[PDB]
Amino acid sequence: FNMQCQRRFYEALHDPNLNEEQRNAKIKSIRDDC
Amino acid sequence: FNMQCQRRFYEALHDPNLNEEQRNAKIKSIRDDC
Amino acid sequence: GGPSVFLFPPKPKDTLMISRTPEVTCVVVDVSHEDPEVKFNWYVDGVEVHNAKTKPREEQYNSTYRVVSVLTVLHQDWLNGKEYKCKVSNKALPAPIEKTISKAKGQPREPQVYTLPPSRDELTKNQVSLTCLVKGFYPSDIAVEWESNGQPENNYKTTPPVLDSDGSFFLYSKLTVDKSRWQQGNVFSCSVMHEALHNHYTQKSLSLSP
Amino acid sequence: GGPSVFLFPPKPKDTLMISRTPEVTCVVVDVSHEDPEVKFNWYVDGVEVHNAKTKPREEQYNSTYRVVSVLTVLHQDWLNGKEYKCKVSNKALPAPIEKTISKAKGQPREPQVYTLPPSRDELTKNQVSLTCLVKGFYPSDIAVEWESNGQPENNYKTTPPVLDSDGSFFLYSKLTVDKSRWQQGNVFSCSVMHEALHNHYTQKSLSLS
Ligand SMILES: *[C@@H]1O[C@H](CO[C@H]2O[C@@H](C)[C@@H](O)[C@@H](O)[C@@H]2O)[C@@H](O[C@@H]2O[C@H](CO)[C@@H](O[C@@H]3O[C@H](CO[C@@H]4O[C@H](CO)[C@@H](O)[C@H](O)[C@@H]4O)[C@@H](O)[C@H](O[C@H]4O[C@H](CO)[C@@H](O)[C@H](O)[C@@H]4O)[C@@H]3O)[C@H](O)[C@H]2NC(C)=O)[C@H](O)[C@H]1NC(C)=O
Numbered sequence: 284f285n286m287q288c289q290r291r292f293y294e295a296l297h298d299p300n301l302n303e304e305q306r307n308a309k310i311k312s313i314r315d316d317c
Numbered sequence: 318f319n320m321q322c323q324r325r326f327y328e329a330l331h332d333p334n335l336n337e338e339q340r341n342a343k344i345k346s347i348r349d350d351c
Numbered sequence: 352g353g354p355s356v357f358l359f360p361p362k363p364k365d366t367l368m369i370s371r372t373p374e375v376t377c378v379v380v381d382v383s384h385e386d387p388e389v390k391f392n393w394y395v396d397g398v399e400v401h402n403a404k405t406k407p408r409e410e411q412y413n414s415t416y417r418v419v420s421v422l423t424v425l426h427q428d429w430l431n432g433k434e435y436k437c438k439v440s441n442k443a444l445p446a447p448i449e450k451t452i453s454k455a456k457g458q459p460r461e462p463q464v465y466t467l468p469p470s471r472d473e474l475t476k477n478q479v480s481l482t483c484l485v486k487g488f489y490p491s492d493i494a495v496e497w498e499s500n501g502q503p504e505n506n507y508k509t510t511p512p513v514l515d516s517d518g519s520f521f522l523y524s525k526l527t528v529d530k531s532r533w534q535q536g537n538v539f540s541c542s543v544m545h546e547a548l549h550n551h552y553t554q555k556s557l558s559l560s561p
Numbered sequence: 562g563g564p565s566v567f568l569f570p571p572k573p574k575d576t577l578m579i580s581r582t583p584e585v586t587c588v589v590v591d592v593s594h595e596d597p598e599v600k601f602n603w604y605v606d607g608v609e610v611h612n613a614k615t616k617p618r619e620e621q622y623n624s625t626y627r628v629v630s631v632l633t634v635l636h637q638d639w640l641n642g643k644e645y646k647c648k649v650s651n652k653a654l655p656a657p658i659e660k661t662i663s664k665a666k667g668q669p670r671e672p673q674v675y676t677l678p679p680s681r682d683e684l685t686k687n688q689v690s691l692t693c694l695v696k697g698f699y700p701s702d703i704a705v706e707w708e709s710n711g712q713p714e715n716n717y718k719t720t721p722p723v724l725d726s727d728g729s730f731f732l733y734s735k736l737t738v739d740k741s742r743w744q745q746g747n748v749f750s751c752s753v754m755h756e757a758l759h760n761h762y763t764q765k766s767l768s769l770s
């Protein structure tokens with residue numbers, strides 16, 4: 284399993300700069316990318 | 318605990334020489350004895 | 352609608368140590384205020400017995416009732432597969448409810464006990480865990496304890512028996528201690544009580560050696 | 562009587578790995594053979610949703626019925642406390658049955674993984690047990706797996722989360738191998754997936770120096 288997607292996911296998940304809406308969006312993207 | 322009673326008990330319980338009745342009887346005795 | 356019944360077996364340690372007194376417990380819930388009479392009937396392998404000690408009902412907080420009858424049993428009898436049937440009779444019951452329980456059937460299997468010292472990575476902490484893997488035993492009825500210097504240690508926590516891939520069970524017991532006590536070389540023992548152990552008892556020690 | 566309902570949470574590993582797909586499952590049992598029509602209503606933190614995938618009912622050997630609705634969720638939403646309500650409506654029921662579930666509330670706690678080699682007394686046997694103690698984590702939602710040489714070893718059995726005296730959980734995972742593979746110095750690794758772990762993942766190797 285991509286060790287990279289897990290990193291970007293955890294990352295986006297705890298990004299204190301993004302709001303619920305943005306986070307979801309950024310996460311979804313990581314999902315579709317892999 | 319009284320390791321001796323535990324032994325006499327085990328002994329009795331697995332004595333192939335006695336029958337249900339004798340067994341129960343012998344076990345009981347060890348019970349009262351300690 | 353109608354009272355509910357639950358039969359509980361005796362405690363592992365109570366059927367194995369001749370000191371204790373093993374008892375099967377019959378609990379009845381949902382007894383009604385205007386229909387509050389409860390009658391118990393106990394049976395061992397069919398034959399009725401009359402030495403059960405029924406406790407005073409207790410009006411439950413949810414406005415119902417709870418009555419309990421405790422039947423003292425014979426260590427042997429349970430260890431031998433005898434069957435304990437409790438029959439509860441009440442007015443709100445079309446017919447008396449019955450419940451039966453016995454020791455799990457199957458060839459006993461002597462547990463294997465192994466003591467594991469702490470992980471190196473744990474010595475950076477002030478308290479370390481002394482592990483006690485107990486495996487391949489059957490039935491799941493078992494009792495594990497810890498001790499040191501002849502005295503019983505109580506800061507331990509045992510996992511419930513887990514079904515292994517070979518049909519037998521295994522569990523782990525984690526006794527937690529101060530790094531100091533462990534590194535000082537103190538000796539701890541993991542004691543197991545099981546019907547398949549010679550004398551229903553055995554122990555394994557654990558200390559510093561490296 | 563009345564058909565009964567049980568709401569099941571997603572698998573720990575599903576909520577943690579972005580690869581997987583976490584789902585909350587709604588099961589309906591004791592579904593009457595005469596009135597088998599079952600309707601599901603799914604709600605997240607109140608708001609209704611409609612992407613649940615309801616499976617065809619199935620007569621159970623005890624001559625009854627069993628229907629299941631699977632709602633796919635968002636790893637974040639679950640991990641963030643969101644509440645999932647399943648509302649089952651059926652004829653033999655005076656009022657629709659409702660069940661709600663969410664992740665356990667409370668301060669998460671990073672787990673510590675420790676690998677223990679077999680006991681000496683066990684080397685007399687043909688197979689030995691490799692232990693992976695995982696302690697002090699919270700909530701109990703966690704996933705332990707073993708592997709070696711990159712490949713997943715599957716002859717293991719993890720115990721279920723046990724509450725420790727400090728209010729945290731701990732479990733143990735026993736991997737069983739051939740003494741031969743062990744003594745040969747092969748390397749095994751216990752991986753743990755938990756929300757309180759950086760990147761929801763960690764590993765600890767174990768072998769014979
Ligand atoms: C008719 O037959 C139904 C299906 O029976 C088949 O499957 C099995 C259940 C076997 O009986 C098999 O021989 C049959 O072919 C019966 O459905 C079951 O009904 C019971 C009673 O409510 C349900 O019990 C619940 O069990 C869950 C455990 O969940 C498990 O989840 C896994 C998946 O993760 C499933 O694969 C397992 O099968 C389990 O379902 C408990 O969590 C739940 O507990 C809660 O309620 C009890 C109530 O007392 C409380 O004590 C607890 O504290 C909880 O609040 C509950 O015990 C069981 O899930 C149903 N099985 C299925 C597959 O859905 C049906 O009962 C039966 N009816 C009659 C009249 O015969």
Ligand SMILES: *[C@@H]1O[C@H](CO[C@H]2O[C@@H](C)[C@@H](O)[C@@H](O)[C@@H]2O)[C@@H](O[C@@H]2O[C@H](CO)[C@@H](O[C@@H]3O[C@H](CO[C@H]4O[C@H](CO)[C@@H](O)[C@H](O)[C@@H]4O)[C@@H](O)[C@H](O[C@H]4O[C@H](CO)[C@@H](O)[C@H](O)[C@@H]4O)[C@@H]3O)[C@H](O)[C@H]2NC(C)=O)[C@H](O)[C@H]1NC(C)=O
Pocket residue numbers: 357378380381411412413415417
């Ligand atoms: C009226 O109130 C009674 C007491 O309720 C408890 O909880 C709160 C709400 C308060 O009311 C308290 O007074 C009390 O603590 C209710 O009695 C309870 O009824 C349930 C069923 O409705 C019983 O559940 C059964 O428990 C068995 C094990 O229980 C153990 O744990 C409790 C507490 O830790 C101990 O008191 C017991 O002695 C036991 O050690 C369990 O084995 C049963 O299994 C279930 O699941 C299996 C799955 O296969 C199934 O086969 C089986 O039939 C069961 O479905 C079950 O869970 C509970 O024992 C009982 N509690 C007590 C203390 O007796 C009563 O229901 C309630 N009635 C109404 C109308 O409100």
